[PDB]
From a paper:
Extensive processing in 2D and 3D, followed by local refinement, improved the Coulomb potential map quality near the RBD and NTD (3.1 Å local resolution), resolving [name] bound to the “inner face” of the RBD in the “up” conformation. The structure revealed a binding interface along the highly conserved class 4 cryptic epitope and partial overlap with the class 1 epitope proximal to the ACE2 receptor-binding site (RBS) but distal to the major protruding ridge of the RBD. Antibody [name] uses both its VH and its VL domains to make extensive, bispecific contacts. The intermolecular β sheet is capped on both ends by additional contacts: at one end, Ser100B in the CDR-H3 forms a side-chain-to-backbone hydrogen bond with Cys379 on the RBD. The two other light-chain hydrogen bonds (Ser93 and Tyr31) both contact Asp405 on the RBD.
[name] potently neutralizes ancestral and contemporary [name]-[name]-2 VOC and many antigenically distinct zoonotic sarbecoviruses poised for human emergence.
Residue numbers in the entry:
A (entry chain R): 335 to 515, 522 to 526
B (entry chain L): 1 to 9, 11 to 27, 27A, 27B, 27C, 28 to 95, 95A, 95B, ...
C (entry chain H): 2 to 35, 35A, 35B, 36 to 82, 82A, 82B, 82C, 83 to 100, ...
Write the structure that this text describes.
Amino acid sequence: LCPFDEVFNATRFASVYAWNRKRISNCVADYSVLYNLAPFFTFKCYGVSPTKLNDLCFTNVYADSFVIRGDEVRQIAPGQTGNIADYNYKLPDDFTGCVIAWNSNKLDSKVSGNYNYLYRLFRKSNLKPFERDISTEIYQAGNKPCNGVAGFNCYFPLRSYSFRPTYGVGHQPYRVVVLSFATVCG
Amino acid sequence: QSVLTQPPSVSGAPGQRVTISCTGSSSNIGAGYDVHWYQQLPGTAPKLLIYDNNNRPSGVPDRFSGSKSGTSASLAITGLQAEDEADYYCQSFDSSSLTGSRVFGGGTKLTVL
Amino acid sequence: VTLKESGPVLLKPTETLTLTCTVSGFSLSNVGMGVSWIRQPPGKALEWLADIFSNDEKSYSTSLKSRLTISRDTSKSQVVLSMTNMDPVDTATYYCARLANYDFWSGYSRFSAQFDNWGQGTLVTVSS
Ligand SMILES: *[C@@H]1O[C@H](CO)[C@@H](O)[C@H](O)[C@H]1NC(C)=O
């Protein structure tokens, strides 16, 4: 078929600031069975309809996977603004694919706080659609120059999630898969 | 008491605009969650009126509209007919708990003068 | 889509209530929709009580999580709500609603789901 188990059932997910990008091509994909039988927390399609994705064919498909905050799943959508949309993962206003998310508090959570997932807190400007910033360096606040080390107005642009089982659904980790849309057919 | 708060009652003259407000906490509305509005005519079950921020189901006249701004949401009725005399309930999803919650407004009684 | 609750009942204080909601027009195994319970005291505001979804994922009111219990039976399309240690205050009209997304053509999102279909409600009286 098509390697969707390698995306949705991956043992580990990337952080939102360094989201993965898997190119899907030369496969037959049954979107209908995935939508109908897999119980995700969210399955929203914007430019297409989930129930009729099989009759469509695309030259290439991208699958982006990352882990974000519970109430940050709101801004994985066209036209949304916020921390994630501006600085971590911007989605085009004419996005045509689908956004899939599910709660992963049973895996990405630790009693001592899981710091393995980072998100970009500070940036000079908003992200372009489907672009990422892997390189991390000290951000200048105010007007004073920075020497390359954190200080009074010099911050590490990467802030760590601290997922714990008792944070509640607002702060619990959510694994998000974004599918972007004639070698791929249903 | 309810997490989302609404004015106890609003009034307006026939054919005149009326607005019902709904404000939330840092969670629910303040956390970017959508706001839905329900209309409950006397002696009947509530009816979905505005299923998302400024989204409207089929069969609802275009004189009903909604908006969201920050930690607050509003419902506006352009005209005012006789049948617009029910209770209007604000609703949202509240994420300040382990499994989540769904919070209703206090209910606003609209009277047509 | 039609949701129907069990008939009105009368209970003594500290009794345990069991309410059954029978659904039609949709299957409880559908991933895009769930069933929830909402109660309204006479002349008071609505109050959400419990929640159940296609994969046995269940949510309850924070203040009433200890007393509430919900379950489903896909073999007969029924959802059951149980409340223990009932007080005379808990008298109200109990509604069975469907937590599904309108604009279902665009997919589903459990965060933005709304009670798009409601039952007619049942009246539960707790008194001596
Ligand atoms: C992932 O694993 C689950 C295990 O139950 C399986 O049902 C599913 O088909 C697998 N693939 C995807 C894409 O979920």
